[PDB]
């Protein structure tokens, strides 16, 4: 349809909390080949985050039930089967997001801000695959997540101020990747503390239109620090 017709209907789907509709509209906007505005970029991000987030939460619930029914043969087999069904849904969602990133989003990203955004998204959705993967296929998945995070991290530190919310949010998810996926509580703590300290050291670079976004991510960086320091 018309791109603006697809965008505002995705904004309606967001208010109605129909994120399957919201992701479908923003996917067609991406499939039209044109670069996304920062508004369309966030609508696509919010939509698929809710779509994949529902499966991650359901996966955690069914996975935990699977381990607490260890000595319940019939109940554990059903929990194992249901976890495998949610996993297949979760892998299809990420594979679509990663497909959109490699064909339209990252290749057509003209700006450093958008490239950092899409490379962080590539690392995020490979991290979501790593949460449900195992073996050598997981090792290749994990390395893809680290490569996307690292390239986005190097571009963000060369092109963005330490108080930039996209750079701060990238350091937040990168540190989460180190703690939860690579089980390095301090390659994450150092990264998170460095991002927090460098943002406080240059608080003069923070903009009025983005300072409540950046201050919030600085609070989250410090929460992960406090929690990982425990």
């Amino acid at each position: 349809m018309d791109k603006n017709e697809l965008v505002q209907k995705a904004k309606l789907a967001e208010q109605a909390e129909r994120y399957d509709d919201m992701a479908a509209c923003m996917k067609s906007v991406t499939e039209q080949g044109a670069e996304l505005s920062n508004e369309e970029r966030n609508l696509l991000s919010v939509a698929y985050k809710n779509v994949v987030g529902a499966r991650r939460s359901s996966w955690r619930v069914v996975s935990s039930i699977e381990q607490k029914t260890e000595g319940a043969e019939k109940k554990q087999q059903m929990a194992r089967e249901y976890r495998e069904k949610i996993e297949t849904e979760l892998r299809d969602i990420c594979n679509d997001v990663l497909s959109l990133l490699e064909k339209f989003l990252i290749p057509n990203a003209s700006q450093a801000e958008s490239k950092v955004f899409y490379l962080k998204m590539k690392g995020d959705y490979y991290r979501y695959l790593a949460e449900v993967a195992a073996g050598d296929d997981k090792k290749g998945i994990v390395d893809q997540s680290q490569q996307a995070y690292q390239e986005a991290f190097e571009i963000s530190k060369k092109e963005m101020q330490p108080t930039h919310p996209i750079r701060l949010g990238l350091a937040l998810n990168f540190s989460v990747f180190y703690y939860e996926i690579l089980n390095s509580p301090e390659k994450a703590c150092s990264l998170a503390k460095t991002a927090f300290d460098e943002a406080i050291a240059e608080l003069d670079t923070l903009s009025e239109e983005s300072y409540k976004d950046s201050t919030l991510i600085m609070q989250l960086l410090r929460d992960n620090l406090t929690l990982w320091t425990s």
Binding site: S45, V46, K49, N50, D124, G169, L172, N173, V176, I217, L220, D223, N224, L227
Partner: peptide
Amino acid sequence: GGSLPN
């Protein structure tokens, strides 16, 4: 408390 929210 974790990763980046919306």
